Every structure is written in C-alpha cells, then in structure tokens.
Amino acid sequence: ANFENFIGATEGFSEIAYQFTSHILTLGYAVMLAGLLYFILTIKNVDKKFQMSNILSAVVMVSAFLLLYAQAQNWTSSFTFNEEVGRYFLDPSGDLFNNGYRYLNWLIDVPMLLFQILFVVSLTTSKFSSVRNQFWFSGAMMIITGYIGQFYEVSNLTAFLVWGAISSAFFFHILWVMKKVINEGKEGISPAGQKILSNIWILFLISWTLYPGAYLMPYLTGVDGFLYSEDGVMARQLVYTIADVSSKVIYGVLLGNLAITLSKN
Ligand SMILES: *C\C=C(C)/C=C/C=C(C)/C=C/C1=C(C)CCCC1(C)C
DSSP states (O other): OOHHHHHHHTTOBOHHHHHHHHHHHHHHHHHHHHHHHHHHHGGGGSOGGGHHHHHHHHHHHHHHHHHHHHHHHHHHTTEEEOTTTOSEEEOTTSOOOOTHHHHHHHHHHHHHHHHHHTTTSOOSSSOHHHHHHHHHHHHHHHHHHHHHHHHTTSSOHHHHHHHHHHHHHHHHHHHHHHHHHHHHHHTTSOHHHHHHHHHHHHHHHHHHHHHHHHHHGGGTTOTTSSSTTHHHHHHHHHHHHHHHIIIIIIHHHHHHHHHHHTTOO
C-alpha cells in the first residue's frame, strides 16, 4: 500500500517508533476535541457579524477530531508485536494502515479553512465570489492530485513526484490568492489588526508548507537514506500533527483574536 505498510512488513517497527507514533496521533485528536470546546464557548465574545468564523472553526474541529481518531485507531491496530524478533510488524489479519482518513479530512477542512477568513476581513477591489471559487477549486484539486500521487508512493516514485508537483501547482495558486486577500484586508483596519493579519499570514505560510514536506519526508535523505526507515515514518507523522494543530487550531484562534480586535471603535 503505502510506505508505512512497506516498513511495517519489511523491517517492522521498534517498540518506540510504534508507541511514539501512537502517542503523538492520540495527542492530535485530543487537541481537536479541546479546540471544539474552545470555539463553542467563546462564540459569545465576538459580534454577530464575525461569528460565522467561529462556526466554521467548530465544524473543522468536529471532523478533525472524528477522522484523526479513526487514523489513530487505524495505526494502533494495524501492527502486532512479534516476540521472536521484538519489533512490530504489519498484521495480515488486520485492515493495514490506511492514510485515506487524513486525505478525506483535508478535502473537507481545506474549503472551510480558506472560506472562513472571508468573514473576518473585507476585500477591497477583489470580488468575494471570485476569491471563494478560486479557493474551492484549486484546494479540491490540490488534495485530489495529492491523493493520486500518494498511491505510487512506494512503487513508482516518478509518478509520486510528477503528481506531487502538480498538486504543488494548485498549492501556489492558493498562496497567491491568500496573499492578495490578506493585503486588501489590511487596508482600512487598525495597526493592531494589521499586526494580527501579518501573524496569520506568517503562520498560514509555514503551517501549510509543512504538509508537502511530510509527503516527501522518507525521500529527503535519498532513496536509501536515514529517513527511508521507521524514522521517516516517525517524522512524517510528527510533522502532520504539528501541522494539524497549526493550520486548524492556532489559525482559528488568531482569526477570533482578529475579530475581537476589529470590534474596538
Ligand atoms: C487539515 C487542514 C489543511 C488545510 C490541510 C492541508 C494540506 C495540505 C496543504 C497538503 C498539501 C500537499 C501538497 C501541496 C503536495 C503534496 C501532497 C500534499 C497533499 C501533502
């Protein structure tokens, strides 16, 4: 299937690479449930006119909690310990590790996370429906073509790469359109609100860029380097979790802070 199952069935996993990976993944959906409560409880702190952004964050948490829980359970019960060798190996009587849960979660979250900014800042010369369509199209295509390259990950590396680059073309359009959005949104508002906007732009840039870095991770030290191992498995799964907390939770907190800042007058 994937590089994970390859390692789980060629070399297997050490006790620590298995446990660590399960612990970080558990932490991942535990944070989503925490955020879900944060965004519901604080929805009263923002004016009626920005609340849609709290609403969109609440829903992202519901799906992120739900699907990252599935993934977590999917990693723990796909490998079983072998007393003879002392590692964890892919269990042929299980379901095999499946990263589909996480791609499904992106296909849902991406439109919302992109849509919700447009309820906090105001455009100037760009049209709302124009920006929204461009966000929804390129973001959908970024995930679909990423999913397709994800199949060739362990077999045909070249297709894994050509498809990853296509998905990168859509990624950069989004980065261009969000650039234009944050600029127009800075026009008018107070200097404090521009400060928050700039933070949001810095965070949006890093947090989304971690994702292709975790897509490629087991190849960044070569077709037989240090990461082509349970360590790249470990590391790709740590970067995703860092990325999920950044692009889903912290992003939405900053938008709420921005909404609040924009009610001073
Ligand atoms: C959970 C929320 C979000 C916004 C997830 C975003 C995921 C990405 C930006 C993924 C991007 C990819 C790219 C650009 C190319 C390689 C394949 C990926 C799907 C990892």
